[PDB]
Amino acid sequence: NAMWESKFVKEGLTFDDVLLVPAKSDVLPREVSVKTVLSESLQLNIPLISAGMDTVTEADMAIAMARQGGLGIIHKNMSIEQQAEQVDKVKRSGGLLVGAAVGVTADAMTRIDALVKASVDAIVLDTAHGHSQGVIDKVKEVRAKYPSLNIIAGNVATAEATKALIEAGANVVKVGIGPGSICTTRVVAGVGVPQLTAVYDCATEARKHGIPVIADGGIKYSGDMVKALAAGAHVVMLGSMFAGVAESPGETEIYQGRQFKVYRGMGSVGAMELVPEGIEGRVPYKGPLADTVHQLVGGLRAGMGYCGAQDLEFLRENAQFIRMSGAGLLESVQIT
């Protein structure tokens, strides 16, 4: 009963537990490189990805997002004809990078072939529990058929889970069980892993093979995104921070004179229409997408200025965190 013993040993860290420690710097924030590479085929100018959710990313979002340096993932709560159409639309809008989300359905192989012929750069094979034989075998089918296609599998929270996917044929791994804003996995199932600890553990596995890791969910401030990138992620993925953007799908509701967008989990009652592990909410209208990106990539250049990082690689390997108490982060006057 070795297992009985290790039940409560492991320990986890979230974004609010740590801070990056400043180091010797001779590179200015405006001078750094926030560029990143997921593969030969996938090169990003800014390490940002919009989430494959029906309230975050359609063709307009992926186009806006591509034009910024990043990448959008067309959600799959759509007919196959429609998704390939939106993919083909983004692709021909200047030869932009687009990604698309595929379920681990029976139909998935059919959906993937439509997306490949519409010329997607990367498909996202995402499910709630990416450490399942269903997903492993599914990746190996897709990899057998398309040995050059960028595959992003998830979701995973552990290194053994990460290893299983890399060997199945995954060249990018997506991290996060529990942490998303609209996520209720932990409340309803008791399951999940602190996102910083998740990213670090998974990155430590992927680092050996040289595979990029996506941090997905739980990000609220540019700060948390700098932390995700220094914890080992190549790239972060946002839902709530883009849902209120002008280029996301769906229109602007007005309630009491204030502008709002709907943001909901893909496993909430709406996106499904087996208990729900997603919820439905509203987010404030944030206007143009460029506004949100400028702030995020600005904050990133500051953090990398503090850490002495010229590029994201220097950041991932050398950056040092410091742990604190909860008392600690109340240290981060009524405001106008």
Place this chain on the structure above:
Amino acid sequence: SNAMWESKFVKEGLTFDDVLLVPAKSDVLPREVSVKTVLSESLQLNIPLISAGMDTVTEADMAIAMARQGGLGIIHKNMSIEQQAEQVDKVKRSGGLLVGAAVGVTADAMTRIDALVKASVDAIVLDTAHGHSQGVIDKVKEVRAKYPSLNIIAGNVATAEATKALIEAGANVVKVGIGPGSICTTRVVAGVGVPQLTAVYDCATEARKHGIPVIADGGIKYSGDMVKALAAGAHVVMLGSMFAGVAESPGETEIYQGRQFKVYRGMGSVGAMEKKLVPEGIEGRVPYKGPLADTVHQLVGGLRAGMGYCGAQDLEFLRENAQFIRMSGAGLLHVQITKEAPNYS
């Protein structure tokens, strides 16, 4: 020796909110998992739930509904021996269903237990605030001598030593929990208690040795807290606050702010004792939930998902192989959640 003096502050405690389950390799879907459990040779549940023997939570109706779902009801003991034997027999008249009844450590305890046996009760629940007592121990021995085949659920405890005590006194099952109840003020009035997750783990660890199942009793708010409990060594969880608002629970529904409410009170509360006192329970109100079946579906639904993340095809696999990860207070905690308007009727 001061060995007791310098060990005053060594032990650490964990509760539900300190931990999360860690996803593992899984080949099993939530709909194919087995939520069956065997408390004993004679007593088997189709779902790991037991409604608590409280006068606001469980009577004959709730036991019948609980059984129908594949769980078990514990008919509370705030009533005559005659009218509790009434309720026991009624559950058995309704399709030979499994039913429990609570019996406190008293003088009339045996007179009460007897009547229950003649009504063909499946399990008797020996409940005391402090189960780690000779008084309780020698009462469990008395019942085992007179009824060798009777299921005995004896509690409550929080330590391994208490556990092995009741097992060797002839109890089939141990009910774990000092202080974690929603309506419990034992931790405030007496400064006494163990964080439930540690108490379960500690008690189960001793009880596995004897092949004895334990029950996690109290402190469960969400369904995820229940997955956490089962995964910590418990065979079955016990619920009061979540079953109180349910329509099949004892008590009139009351209207406040147009909303309907039901009364949930501790058995150690002032009102419950009246059916110079230092109470260790409080009276409150919980919202009307509706039918029992809708509440159970969400609980079991969250269990299956949780077992699916862990790769447990059965509850025994979860008990033995599941792994927790500890977080800080920050770890337990933009988008405004949209909740639909209420039903006034």
Place this chain on the structure above:
Amino acid sequence: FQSNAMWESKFVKEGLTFDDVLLVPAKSDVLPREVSVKTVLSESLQLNIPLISAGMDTVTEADMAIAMARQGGLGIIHKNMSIEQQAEQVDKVKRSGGLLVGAAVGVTADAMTRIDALVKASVDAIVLDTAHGHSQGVIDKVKEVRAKYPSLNIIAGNVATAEATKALIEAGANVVKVGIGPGSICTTRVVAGVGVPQLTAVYDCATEARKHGIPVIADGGIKYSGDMVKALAAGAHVVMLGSMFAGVAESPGETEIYQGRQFKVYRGMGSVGAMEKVPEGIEGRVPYKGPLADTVHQLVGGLRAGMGYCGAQDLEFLRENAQFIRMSGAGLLVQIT
């Protein structure tokens, strides 16, 4: 060789308070209402119940001190009055039933004068309260008194330290008062950044006062019945309450109505108001709780239950055998009516 010990040890010590721990149940076949809560501070000083009301002008005067003694406890009459009036408050208590009584004196020039008046008034114990008991002036004050009154019960405080407790014991003190900072009306921790978590302070103090068989008093920080149990179980013989007794019928001062609700004034001795008749006390208000008896009945009832879970027949077993478990903030966490 220059030592770097002090510099490196700056952040090593760790502290616990009441909310940080819970008591673990043990085997126990003593019922709560059959436990002995009798306690012995000295042969001269025996209490039925382990309770002492604080020497504050908002908490303890004659009528209060009578009430406490009669419940089996003890009142420490406060020193914010003339010597002549303090000694007459002590007399009134002493001659109504032959009750035990305490009396507060500060380390001052006219302290010795006050003590004799109080000793002549047949006081059972005097309490030498200073904000910092580990001072040379306080230590020399205790030798000064022990020398002249070798039969007198002396309580010296406040201390937070094992050293400090050793220091006051060696000066001749029968009983030690423990507490720097944990007061409800205290702002020492905020205006000066000084203090020790009450549970650790007690534990660390009693650890030293055990070697000499000297009792300690847990001074402040108790908000709930269960926190008193935690104090006694950490090494204290007795506990001193202020806030809890301040809003009681036998308290000095009358009942004020605030938004149609009955209240009483409770203020620190270091607050501006007490000082006139930099502050490290503030003034507040506490709910009117009625007569002392019901508050004592719930605090003693709460101890009885605690000793019942722990298997403690008497306060000595609890003090020597009770084991705690540490929890976290989430472990400290329905519509109550």
Place this chain on the structure above:
Amino acid sequence: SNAMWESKFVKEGLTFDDVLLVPAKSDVLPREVSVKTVLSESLQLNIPLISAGMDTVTEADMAIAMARQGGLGIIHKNMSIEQQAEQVDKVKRSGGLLVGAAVGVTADAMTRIDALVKASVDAIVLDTAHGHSQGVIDKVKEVRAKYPSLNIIAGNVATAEATKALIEAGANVVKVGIGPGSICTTRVVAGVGVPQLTAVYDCATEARKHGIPVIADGGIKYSGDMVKALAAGAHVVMLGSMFAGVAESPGETEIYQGRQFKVYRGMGSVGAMVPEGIEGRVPYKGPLADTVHQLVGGLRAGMGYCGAQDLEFLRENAQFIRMSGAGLLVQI
């Protein structure tokens, strides 16, 4: 290698609210303690309080009132060079008092230092969000090269390595703080910061091997926090928020919801110039001396418990005890 990779989450950090000061044996009455302090042969303060170099906190009126309480004011740089040099001289002619002036790491830096030295300023404060840069080190070396006896205060830093590097560039005094500030959002926008107590200790531990003092800057909300910061190795502390609402502070009283407030904002906020400071309001605290009285009042109290006759005893002998959140836990 894998060394940097495994060191990522190893370090722990403490802030003011994490700890308290352990009362030791005491000979000393609060009124008899010496709160005097010496930065430099050139520079000495009767109290350990330095007024922050911000457009919301300090100008010539504030600097004068600081000096006359026993401390120091640091004239901010959001002004013309000869406007700043005129502020420095107005304080100088107001009774031969102590003044400092903030200076940025730019090309006009040396041009502005020439004017400030011309008005006989005592110390300059080279302030940057990131003092551990080659820019600041190179600037310090070239000022130390030209003005060898000018007191140079350099920062901010948060580490020993940074502290060491500035001492070897020529800084007499080292300023410590990245994140702790009340108007600071560096933690939130860049995820970067170091808990102040751990920072001052780690920076003092390196500084006292050179006889170099450190300033603890920001995060101070209580007098008890100042006692804590001095006891972890700081000679002197710098305050912004607790000085913004006083009368001698730049601007004047303004009214929100019919109460009196004074605007208080960071130098990296939108107004004072991506933002890392914010803009807000603090209550009109009244005159400077009343606030100073309560601060130094608190310090005498804390030195009393710890038994420190002077700030050196405190710095070398004070012991902390760590606690939890429930440890930092009557209608007042």
